[PDB]
């Protein structure tokens, strides 16, 4: 520990970058010799010779054959590829290959690529696109594009895609889902992996090729070190390997490079000296000694001419100049003095010499000259590349782009200068090492040259350098000490480095570290303290310390030198993510303020440290003052300030001025390449700070920089596909652009007065992005306003202008348009480019009430593309302030003896002696009265005991009364059922039952059950049938728990059933008692009034009265990138534990399954850093090993051994039990639970920490806020009435959510109804059941609801403007009218005389099976007389009930090859629709395929609805008379039950009966359950090699297997009555007493056999009679139909189960 | 031996650099010791959107508190197409018209001026009286003239009423100079004015363009018609107010 020294990093820096020369002498090959001339010296180095070939070349025929396509059309690996193929293709070992340029490294890289491509070959289709990604890192952008097409062409036979990475943000993530090999530059890959929080696609990286890895020696080198250290260290902390491949030049320290790549030097290091160059190179270096300005200049042209003369006619000469300006000039200067005499064929040149024209070019061709630079047209130097390739061009003067981006070789290469102007340095400097090697690397064409000739002309002072570079002697050093602060911040922002210990470990992976060990003298270190610090531990700590301090001073990081801990900041994250050096971010931090002019914004940009080397040269103040004099944004600073120069160049670039100074245009390019991401940094800073005015200015400046125009230019200029010139037409007609939308086509042609293009302007006027906004104000309270914003697009999409999406910013600004009260990012996709979009958010409001807010939606990319909606509150009806709570009276706590029933007292007195104050206040009313009671109290108030009181009262009155207990969540229900099973069943001999899906089952549970526990949907399905069912109306007590959830997403079902129980009690006139429990409600009186609770019997307690006092703390967190925000919460979680509960149990809720594991480990690492390791384990490592013998999660046991547990949906059921056990016992002090488990946790804690309050939604690809109900429920876990004097809770949220949480946690909760959005399926049910028979019945029905009450108390919320009595019958009528017409249009009801409604057949099926009315509608269209078992699944998958099956891009792939294995290949697959995932999951289920555990839990919910949908279909096919498809769906019910296809064998239903068993029985003559049920008894145990316990399982199935012999008879068969009744009697008698339900181990819920009896004409495909039938013992069923005319027809009977396969009976009978 | 060269120093560049510091005067606003209550939020915005040499003006609209009809709460400022000098501000003859202002009564106008003065300007009386003579909605006993003068590092506000005799003089006055004939200090009284934080005011701005025409005075004439919209005004030197400065690089 302990940094002991603060370094000066700048002193340690190698100033010359890649021009640094570590070697002080350079030895040359033997033939080298030096000359001397007038003004220049010449060094000649002779061409090497290959060395005596000491193994043989490899025929491609011997490569592994999965790999032979990459080498299609190839003979034989060359020398290098042949030495590398075994290391490349037969092993996974990391490689470092040093070879001369073009020796064949690229094919060696394909070989590694091909090995990884192999890792995902089955014989399947062939390659699995999904399992991997390959990253090719190339230095130059020109290199990337060549490699993309070159690799793509060679691998397209493998069906893989290679793509460059465009500089974009969110459109370039789309292309990563599609490509397998990504080719990018080091800095591009650095930017992407600096964010990583996307739920990355970079976890698929299996292979990283680092081409030209000697870039380490460049100023860009540290990017390479940042990449490798991040990858190798990520290998440590995930244990999945990534292969690394380095390709470098042959230079010193390559072995240190190999150490840095973790290359085994005895396995993966390959060094091929320059004698392996493809064509031998004769080198010539020319060192000019003349230091005179431009006599050196013409000495250069003198040397160029003499050298070019040596090659006239004999060889083409590629002359390299270092500016797109110098290509033409030098090329013509050569041709100029070659007019003295020339030396040549010519009219194949002259033909194309002005077929193609282009200024200069056979002014620059006569004697086959040419230029090549990035400014020329694509084809205007496409086969100008290839006039050279045909040996037709004699001289080509080019830049370095041709060397990097085009495979164009030449016998002679002349590098004219070695000096280039560098704006980043603001100075002329030498070329980079890569450029020199790349250019000279192009000397000597592949076949035709026996030697290339490279001529380098430079200043004589640089000879040793270029001599060293080209002869294996320029060492590769590390340049990273400069960039260490920036790089280290990136690792902190990622959470990879959380303290200086981490950073020192991280630093040890740098190339810098290797070099510091091998060569400490070079790196400022030191032989005699190295040996006193042999790992350089102190040194690294000191460097990291210096960097940390710098980052702390600039406010990127919070670093305290004691702990050595790092703390991420938002500024810190912005610096890393926008690739901005940290000095710049501090300047922004101090200068950026909300009061900022555009004058001062332009000044702030110009002060960015990226420009720290720019100066105002004297030969620059020409234009710089001419432009500054009248430039549109004034510049306060003088001309002598370089800040003013950068300012002028930015504005000149936007106005598209073109300047005359050579350096100034070069400086302008550097300034504005940087501006894009620099200005976006400022945008993100000010937007996230809320500064409305500055945000608008900066986002404008982004778009101006991007589109090179000011706002005051007509926005039609942005239509890239625009060669018109006819907006300067429009711009001189100064008139509002928004006015052209109004008008047609011809009047535009008249305003701008060009008639011929009135229509085209009109076309582009409406291609311009334009949105319309409407708003629905929804008051929540008098201080919080909910807003529903509807965005309606008002333009035409066109992928030629818009692509696949258009991004917008939604901005809610206050009265003065200076504070952004809320903002969010809105993305309009082309698939929904014609739909309305709904957005909801919360904003604060105060009660003097501001005049208005404003809603802006502006284009993220388009200039002048914004819509602002004033949101005025002059007519906003606020709800009334909530009434005071019910006063908690200081009654002495009521003892359990006041029950006056020793049996009843046996349920409590063991645990506690007195009920709490809340229970004591309500007791009398609940116990000694039958009044309807409302109890509203904070969760954890013992509200459920109060309902137990009412049940106890019922049991005394009735002795056999029914009580229905409703709770909103299935996890709460199952917990209530156990506690209440012990009490009322075990200790009171009543019946406690918990309903399931099956109505057949639940119906009997309602008869026998003394108390029935139920979720809402399960009671809705049954209470709908209340007029048919006495059990439903004969309910003494109806308890609805957690009733405040009527305002949540699933509220309406709960609201419908309660109102139904209120309505039923009116009809039956023998009242049902209703008790409602609730979290503290602000509008408690409305709930009580709706449920008939007298005000004296409504207990409205507010948060302050919770029996165990609650200490709630809400910590705000500023970071808006949720991944970084979570990181900044990691340590504060641990600190909260020590502050608020260092000894008592802690529950930490985290947003996702993955996060439980991470935070548990995080808490432990911080615990061990406290060196309080295992402070959370209160039992010895001994008591835990009886518990720790279930490691199905390998990591939970390391966690438990250190005192921490975690809980998520992925752990086994009893895994969750043991963590809960060890937790509630006290042995484990901390448990980290996922947010989804917050409703079914059987443990409680002293302290609850809520780590963030958002979760990612896989479907909608967006972060969702925790519902307020879930937060209340999480907080209620900080309550231990037996052990704690207090409960504590810390909520860590994004700061923008803080005020909301204080409002709705401290104060009681306001709840509204959302039944007005859920009307159809319930109206359908009440029209079926005849409760609603006309449009007036529908109105009366609405007034029983909770929705009604709230309409008068908060009209605006439900879209009312007055609570007048006619206002809301008008409103109620409209709701009735639109719900009935939808139901009528979808053919579930009929409407007579604009008034009378009645149920249709579909409506009956929908209400009966609890099926959404639109699901049954698509059923009615798709179902048809012919579709069979295949198309049935196809139409059931499309049900609305399966619309919300989750979709993750993870299994966007397992299903891609699951459709490969399903029997029924599917119509037109799209693969991210839930309806096709459900299709494949259903097929995967009948084939007994085992999937993920995630796809397993997905399927268990799919199957939970299937039987209802299958049965809805059978009910539809039959009433239409279709015999074949009906029976087909009837066997689908048994199919989905036992998981089978009908082609499968009936014996696949028996336990332990596997693959080979059926072949053993088809071989003998048994193929039925009955064929087994008796072959001679032990003649079967010798036929099934099975355990005696396994045999016992096969017997139980056979005894539950249906054994009914059916009797059919027909009444009075002597009567052909030509069209009358034909009763037919069927009797069913089984031999057994079916003790138990259906035995189907692969179906999630317990079923009971359901039977159909069908009458049909086999030949006719004609069902005649149909009736369902539940059967055991007795069963007689009657079927009837109408006779035909003729006396000769036979029908066939059908006995059909919905559970078992192979029991289907079939008799034939002609009844005349 | 001379050879010196003039390089233009356009003065709107210097004044535009000053306008960016206007926000600092909004921390040092002083009021001079019927009744009119100006809300601070629109006043501060009105200061920032202004200029140190060119006057700008805004119409005042409000309503008396429920039971207190002797005080006028200023609830809205309307910016209309205008240009100004250091002595007046040229408004269009047409007074604002909008549904939102119909529930309110007009209370006069507020304008800025360079230097403080113990007296309401003569061309200010002429302006106010000439408006009253064309619009009987301006009571005279209820419409005021709030001056906002740029004292050093500060902003001092004074609210004046017109007298009956000041009205009859201002209508007939044609001398636009700063000492016309028949001008007398008995043409105006001071009225009680208070700056408050209790309620917020709001702005209305032109619908088809902005309010600032000082860089394009030719396309502005007294007969110009304009609609309004609920929105806040843009600063004086904002881009949209001087598009020539931007578009005139298509020549450079």
């Amino acid at each position: 520990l302990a940094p002991r020294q603060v370094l000066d990093l700048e002193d340690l820096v190698f100033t010359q970058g890649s021009h640094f020369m570590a070697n002080k002498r350079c030895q040359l090959p033997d033939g080298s010799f030096r000359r001397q001339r007038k003004g220049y010296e010449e060094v000649h180095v002779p061409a090497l010779k290959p060395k005596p070939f000491g193994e043989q070349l490899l025929p491609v025929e011997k490569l592994p054959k999965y790999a032979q396509a990459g080498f299609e059309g190839f003979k034989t690996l060359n020398r290098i590829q042949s030495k590398l193929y075994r290391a490349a293709l037969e092993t996974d070992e990391n490689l470092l290959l040093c070879a001369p340029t073009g020796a064949g490294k690229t094919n060696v890289a394909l070989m590694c690529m091909l090995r990884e491509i192999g890792k995902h070959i089955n014989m399947d289709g062939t390659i699995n696109v999904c399992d991997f990604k390959i990253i090719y890192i190339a230095p130059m952008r020109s290199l990337v594009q060549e490699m993309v097409g070159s690799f793509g062409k060679r691998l397209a036979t493998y069906g893989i895609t290679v793509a460059e990475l465009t500089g974009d943000h969110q459109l370039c993530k789309e292309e990563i889902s599609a490509t397998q090999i990504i080719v990018c530059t080091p800095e591009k890959w650095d930017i992407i992996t600096r964010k990583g929080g996307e739920r990355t696609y970079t976890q698929l990286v299996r292979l990283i090729i680092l081409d030209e890895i000697h870039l380490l020696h460049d100023d860009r080198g540290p990017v390479l070190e940042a990449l490798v250290a991040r990858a190798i260290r990520n290998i440590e902390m995930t244990q999945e390997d990534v292969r690394l491949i380095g390709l470098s030049a042959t230079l010193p320290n390559y072995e240190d490079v190999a150490t840095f790549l973790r290359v085994d030097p005895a396995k993966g290091l390959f060094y091929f000296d320059n004698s392996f160059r493809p064509v031998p190179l004769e080198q010539t270096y020319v060192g000019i000694t003349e230091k005179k300005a431009i006599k050196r200049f013409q000495i250069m042209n003198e040397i160029v001419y003499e050298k070019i003369m040596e090659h006239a006619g004999k060889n083409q000469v590629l002359v390299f100049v270092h500016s797109r300006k110098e290509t033409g000039k030098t090329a013509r200067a050569i041709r100029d003095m070659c007019l003295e005499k020339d030396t040549l064929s010519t009219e194949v040149l002259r033909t194309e010499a002005e077929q193609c024209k282009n200024l200069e070019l056979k002014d620059l061709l006569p004697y086959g000259f040419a230029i090549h630079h990035a400014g020329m047209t694509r084809v205007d130097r496409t086969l100008v590349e290839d006039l050279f390739a045909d040996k037709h061009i004699q001289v080509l003067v080019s830049t370095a782009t041709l060397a990097w981006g085009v495979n164009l070789p030449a016998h002679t290469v002349i590098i004219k200068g070695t000096q280039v102007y560098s704006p980043e340095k603001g100075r002329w400097t030498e070329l980079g090492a890569l450029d020199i090697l790349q250019m000279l690397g192009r000397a000597g064409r592949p076949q035709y040259d026996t030697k290339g000739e490279g001529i380098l002309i430079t200043s004589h002072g640089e000879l040793q350098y270029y001599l060293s570079l080209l002869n294996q002697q320029l060492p590769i050093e590390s340049q990273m000490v400069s960039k260490l602060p920036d790089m280290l911040n990136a690792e902190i922002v990622l959470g990879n480095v959380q303290n200086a210990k981490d950073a020192v470990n991280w630093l040890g992976y740098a190339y810098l570290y290797i070099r510091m060990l091998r060569s400490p003298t070079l790196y400022g270190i030191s032989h005699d303290d190295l040996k006193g610090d042999p790992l350089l531990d102190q040194r690294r700590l000191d460097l990291v310390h210096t960097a940390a301090l710098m980052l702390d001073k600039n406010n990127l990081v919070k670093y305290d030198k004691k702990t050595g801990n790092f703390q991420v900041t938002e500024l810190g994250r912005i610096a890393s993510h926008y690739y901005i050096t940290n000095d710049t971010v501090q300047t922004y931090n101090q200068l950026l303020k909300p009061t900022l002019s555009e004058i001062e914004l332009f000044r702030v940009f110009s002060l960015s440290s990226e420009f720290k080397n720019i100066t105002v040269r004297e030969e620059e103040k020409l234009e710089l003052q001419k432009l500054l004099e009248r430039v549109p944004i004034p510049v306060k600073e003088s001309i002598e300030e370089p800040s003013a120069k950068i300012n002028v160049l930015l504005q000149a670039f936007i106005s598209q001025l073109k300047l005359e100074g050579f350096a100034l245009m070069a400086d302008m390019v550097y300034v504005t390449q940087s501006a894009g991401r620099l200005m976006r940094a400022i945008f993100e800073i000010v937007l996230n700070r809320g500064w409305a005015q500055l945000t608008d200015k900066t986002l404008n400046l982004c778009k101006m920089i991007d589109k090179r125009m000011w706002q005051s230019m007509c926005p039609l200029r942005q239509f890239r596909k625009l060669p018109e010139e006819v907006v300067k037409k429009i711009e001189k007609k100064n008139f509002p652009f928004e006015r052209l939308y109004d008008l047609n086509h011809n009047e535009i042609g008249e305003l701008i007065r060009m008639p011929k293009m009135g229509k085209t302007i009109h076309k582009y006027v409406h291609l311009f992005p334009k949105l319309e906004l409407s708003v629905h104000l929804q008051p929540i309270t008098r201080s919080t306003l909910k807003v529903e914003l509807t965005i309606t697009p008002d333009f035409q999409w066109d992928e030629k202008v818009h692509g696949s999406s258009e991004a917008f910013w939604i901005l809610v600004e206050d009265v003065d348009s200076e504070v952004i009260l809320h903002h969010e990012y809105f993305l309009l996709k082309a698939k929904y480019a014609q739909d309305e979009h709904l957005i909801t958010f919360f904003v604060p409001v105060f009660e003097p009430l501001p005049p208005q807010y404003f809603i802006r939606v502006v284009s993220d990319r388009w200039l002048s593309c914004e819509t602002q909606l004033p949101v005025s509150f002059r007519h906003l009806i606020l709800p009334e302030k909530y009434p005071p709570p019910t006063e908690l009276l200081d009654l002495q706590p009521l003892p359990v003896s006041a029950l006056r029933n020793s049996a009843f007292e046996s349920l409590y007195q063991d645990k506690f002696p007195f009920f709490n104050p809340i229970q004591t206040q309500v007791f009398n009313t609940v116990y000694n009265s039958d009044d309807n009671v409302f109890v509203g109290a904070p969760t954890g108030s013992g509200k459920t005991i109060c309902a137990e009181f009412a049940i106890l009262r019922m049991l005394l009155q009735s002795s056999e009364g029914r009580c229905v207990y409703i709770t909103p969540m299935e996890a709460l229900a199952e917990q209530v059922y156990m506690d209440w099973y012990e009490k009322f069943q075990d200790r009171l001999n009543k019946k406690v039952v918990l309903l399931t899906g099956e109505t057949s089952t639940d119906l009997k549970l309602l008869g026998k059950g003394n108390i029935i526990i139920s979720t809402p949907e399960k009671w809705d399905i049954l209470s709908r049938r209340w007029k048919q069912r006495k059990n439903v109306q004969n309910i003494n007590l109806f308890v609805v728990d957690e009733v405040h959830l009527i305002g949540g997403e699933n509220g309406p079902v709960l609201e419908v059933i309660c109102s139904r129980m209120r309505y039923i009690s009116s009809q039956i006139e023998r009242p049902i008692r209703i008790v409602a429990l609730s979290s503290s409600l602000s509008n408690a009186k409305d709930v009580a009034h709706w449920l008939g609770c007298s005000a004296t019997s409504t207990f409205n307690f507010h948060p302050n009265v919770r029996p165990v006092p609650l200490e709630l703390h809400i910590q705000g967190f500023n970071i808006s990138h949720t991944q970084t925000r979570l990181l900044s919460m990691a340590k504060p979680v641990y600190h909260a534990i020590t502050k608020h509960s260092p000894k008592k149990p802690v529950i930490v809720f985290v947003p996702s399954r993955k996060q439980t594991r991470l935070t548990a480990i995080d808490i432990l690492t911080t615990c061990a850093a406290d060196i309080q390791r295992q402070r959370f384990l209160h039992c010895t490592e001994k008591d835990l090993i009886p518990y720790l013998e279930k490691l199905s999660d390998s990591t939970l046991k390391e966690t438990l051994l250190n005192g921490v547990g975690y809980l998520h949906e992925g752990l086994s059921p009893m895994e969750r039990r043991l963590v809960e056990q060890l937790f509630s016992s006290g042995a484990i002090q901390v448990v980290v639970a996922s947010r989804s488990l917050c409703w079914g946790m059987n443990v409680a804690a002293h302290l609850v920490i809520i780590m963030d309050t958002q979760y990612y939604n896989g479907k909608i690809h967006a972060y969702v806020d925790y519902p307020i109900y879930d937060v209340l429920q999480m907080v209620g876990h900080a309550n231990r009435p037996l052990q704690d004097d207090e409960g504590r809770c810390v909520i860590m949220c994004q700061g923008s959510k803080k005020d909301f949480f204080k409002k709705f946690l401290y104060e009681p909760l306001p709840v509204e109804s959302h039944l007005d959005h859920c009307m159809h399926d319930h109206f359908n049910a009440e029209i079926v059941t005849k409760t609603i028979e006309n449009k007036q019945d529908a109105v009366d029905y609405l007034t029983w609801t909770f929705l009604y009450r709230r309409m008068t108390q908060n009209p605006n919320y439900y879209n009312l403007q007055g609570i007048s009595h006619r206002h809301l019958s008008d409103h109620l009528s409209e709701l009735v009218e639109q719900t009935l017409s939808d139901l009528e249009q979808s053919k579930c009801i009929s409407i007579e005389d604009e008034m009378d409604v009645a149920p249709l057949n579909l409506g009956m099926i929908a209400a009966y099976y609890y099926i959404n009315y639109t699901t049954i509608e698509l059923f009615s269209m798709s179902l048809n007389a012919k579709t069979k078992v295949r198309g049935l699944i196809e139409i059931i998958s499309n049900a609305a009930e399966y619309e919300n099956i989750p979709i993750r891009h993870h299994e966007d792939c397992l299903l891609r090859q699951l459709a490969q294995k399903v029997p029924h290949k599917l119509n037109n697959p799209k693969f991210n629709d839930p309806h096709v995932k459900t299709n494949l999951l259903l097929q995967a289920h009948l084939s007994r395929m085992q999937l993920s555990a995630e796809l397993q839990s997905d399927t268990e919910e799919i199957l939970s609805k299937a039987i209802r949908l299958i049965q809805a279909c059978v009910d539809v096919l039959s009433s239409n008379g279709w015999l074949s498809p009906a029976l087909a769906a009837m066997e689908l019910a048994q199919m989905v039950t036992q998981a089978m296809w009908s082609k499968d064998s009936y014996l696949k239903q028996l336990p332990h009966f596997t693959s080979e068993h059926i072949k053993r029985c088809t071989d003998k003559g048994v193929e039925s359950v009955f064929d087994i049920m008796e072959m001679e008894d032990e003649e079967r145990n010798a036929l099934l090699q099975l355990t005696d316990s396994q045999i016992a399982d096969v017997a139980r199935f056979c005894n539950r297997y249906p054994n009914i012999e059916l009797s059919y008879e027909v009444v009075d068969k002597d009567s052909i009555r030509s069209g009358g009744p034909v009763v037919v009697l069927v009797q069913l008698e089984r031999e057994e007493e079916v003790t138990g339900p259906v035995i189907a181990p692969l179906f999630p819920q317990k079923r009971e056999e359901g039977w159909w009896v069908v009458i049909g004409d086999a030949k006719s495909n004609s069902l005649i009679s149909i009736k369902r039938l539940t059967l055991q013992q007795k069963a007689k069923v009657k079927l009837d139909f109408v006779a035909p005319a003729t006396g000769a027809h036979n029908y066939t009977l059908y006995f059909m189960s919905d559970a078992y396969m192979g029991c289907d009976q079939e008799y034939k009978f002609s009844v005349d | 031996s001379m050879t010196q060269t003039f390089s233009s120093k356009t003065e709107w560049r210097v004044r535009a650099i000053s306008a960016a510091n206007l926000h600092l005067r909004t921390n040092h606003i002083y009021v001079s010791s019927y009744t009119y209550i100006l809300p601070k939020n629109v006043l501060k915005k009105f200061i920032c959107i202004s200029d140190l040499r060119a006057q700008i003006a805004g119409y005042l609209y409000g309503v008396s508190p429920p039971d207190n009809p002797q005080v006028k709460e200023i609830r809205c400022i309307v910016m209309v197409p205008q240009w100004g000098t250091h002595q007046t501000v040229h408004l269009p003859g047409q007074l604002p018209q909008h549904e939102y202002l119909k529930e309110m009564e007009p209370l006069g106008w507020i304008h800025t001026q360079p230097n403080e003065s113990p007296q309401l300007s003569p061309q200010d009386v002429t302006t106010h009286a000439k408006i009253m003579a064309d619009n009987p909605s301006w009571d005279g006993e209820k419409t005021i003239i709030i001056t906002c003068s740029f004292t050093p590092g500060s902003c001092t506000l004074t609210a004046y009423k017109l007298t009956p005799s000041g009205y009859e003089w201002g209508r007939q006055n044609t001398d636009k100079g700063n000492n016309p004939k028949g001008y007398l200090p008995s043409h105006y009284e001071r009225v009680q004015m208070l700056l408050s934080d209790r309620f917020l005011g709001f702005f209305m701005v032109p619908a088809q363009s902005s309010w600032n025409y000082n860089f394009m005075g030719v396309r502005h004439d007294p007969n110009m018609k304009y609609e309004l919209q609920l929105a806040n005004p843009k600063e004086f030197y904002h881009e949209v107010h001087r598009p020539s400065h931007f578009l005139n690089f298509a020549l450079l």
Side-chain angles (χ1 to χ4, degrees), chain A residues 847-864:
Chain A
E847 204 152 336
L849 220 73
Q852 79 277 321
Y853 291 169
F854 298 97
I855 289 174
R856 311 205 305 134
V857 47
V858 316
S859 189
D860 189 57
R861 48 191 279 212
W862 289 83
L863 210 53
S864 285

Side-chain angles (χ1 to χ4, degrees), chain A residues 888-928:
Chain A
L888 187 63
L889 303 140
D890 193 19
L891 261 292
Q892 185 269 15
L894 181 98
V896 316
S897 75
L899 280 176
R900 301 197 149 60
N901 197 282
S902 287
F904 291 174
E905 296 162 25
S906 160
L907 312 190
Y908 300 104
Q909 63 204 0
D910 271 348
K911 292 104 64 182
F912 59 91
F914 305 92
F915 301 102
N916 60 45
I918 287 161
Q919 293 152 352
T920 298
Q921 290 220 162
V922 304
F923 171 74
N924 164 79
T925 300
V926 179
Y927 207 53
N928 309 310

Side-chain angles (χ1 to χ4, degrees), chain A residues 1231-1326:
Chain A
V1231 69
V1232 184
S1234 91
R1235 64 160 265 89
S1236 41
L1237 288 184
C1238 78
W1239 287 106
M1241 223 152 292
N1242 326 71
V1243 283
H1246 176 221
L1247 181 271
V1248 165
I1249 292 165
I1250 298 174
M1251 212 195 54
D1252 212 24
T1253 55
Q1254 322 177 31
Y1255 65 102
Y1256 192 78
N1257 197 11
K1259 313 114 214 161
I1260 80 183
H1261 56 63
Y1263 279 105
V1264 175
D1265 296 316
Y1266 284 16
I1268 183 54
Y1269 310 97
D1270 289 39
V1271 172
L1272 291 155
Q1273 169 71 14
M1274 277 148 63
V1275 166
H1277 290 76
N1279 160 51
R1280 260 140 47 90
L1282 288 179
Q1283 305 115 298
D1284 290 333
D1285 296 332
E1286 75 280 305
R1288 281 165 194 166
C1289 172
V1290 175
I1291 297 195
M1292 292 168 185
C1293 52
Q1294 199 177 352
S1296 67
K1297 323 273 168 186
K1298 178 162 160 211
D1299 301 342
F1300 179 100
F1301 279 127
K1302 314 184 61 80
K1303 280 189 223 158
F1304 296 100
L1305 265 39
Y1306 292 95
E1307 287 178 18
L1309 185 75
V1311 303
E1312 303 285 359
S1313 162
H1314 303 92
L1315 185 50
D1316 48 348
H1317 299 72
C1318 273
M1319 215 70 95
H1320 300 61
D1321 290 308
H1322 295 114
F1323 264 20
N1324 179 74
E1326 307 296 349

Side-chain angles (χ1 to χ4, degrees), chain A residues 378-396:
Chain A
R378 182 46 157 264
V379 70
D380 203 27
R381 35 91 191 160
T382 307
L383 80 178
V384 189
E385 255 162 63
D386 309 73
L387 262 186
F388 200 101
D390 292 11
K391 315 192 71 180
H392 287 355
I393 292 173
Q394 295 295 293
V395 184
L396 174 50

Side-chain angles (χ1 to χ4, degrees), chain A residues 423-436:
Chain A
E424 207 280 297
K425 310 292 188 166
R427 181 225 324 175
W428 288 88
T429 54
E430 295 291 295
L431 287 170
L434 294 213
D435 294 311
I436 292 299

